[PDB]
Amino acid sequence: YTDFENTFQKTVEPVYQMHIKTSKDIAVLRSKEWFQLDDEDFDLLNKTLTFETETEVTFKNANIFSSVKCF
């Protein structure tokens, strides 16, 4: 089959944990567009963040996704 236009995939990514040890990690996180916070001034230093993400990918072909969403 090659009807990739009709193919889609939802996957619940495994729960990820990050320990913020230094301000370098905070700067790296804030440099990511996808990483958004309700309270932009939230103090992330010395804190543990848990990410529970769901990925929706629509395929263009066998290898390259036509669109990738991770929410």
Added chain:
Amino acid sequence: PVMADLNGGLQFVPELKEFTAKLRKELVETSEVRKAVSIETALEHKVV
């Protein structure tokens, strides 16, 4: 006997040790932050 002070006015800054440490800390922090952000942007570009 003569004391020549060729210090360049370094004695007039208050808390010279702490201010020197602050300068080095700000420079190092900027360097590591920029390097980490550049590396992560590069990895995001490569995976995308």
Added chain:
Amino acid sequence: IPRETIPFLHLRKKTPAGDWKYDRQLSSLFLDGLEKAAFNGVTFKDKYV
């Protein structure tokens, strides 16, 4: 203490320029401690020297 005079025993405070100068507050504290040690006596209990 007289005004504008340096006691024989005093404590010096480091100025922002880095030099040690006579300080009224520290000198008064030290002289008060000496007065108390002279009149009431000073204990050194639980002091390991």
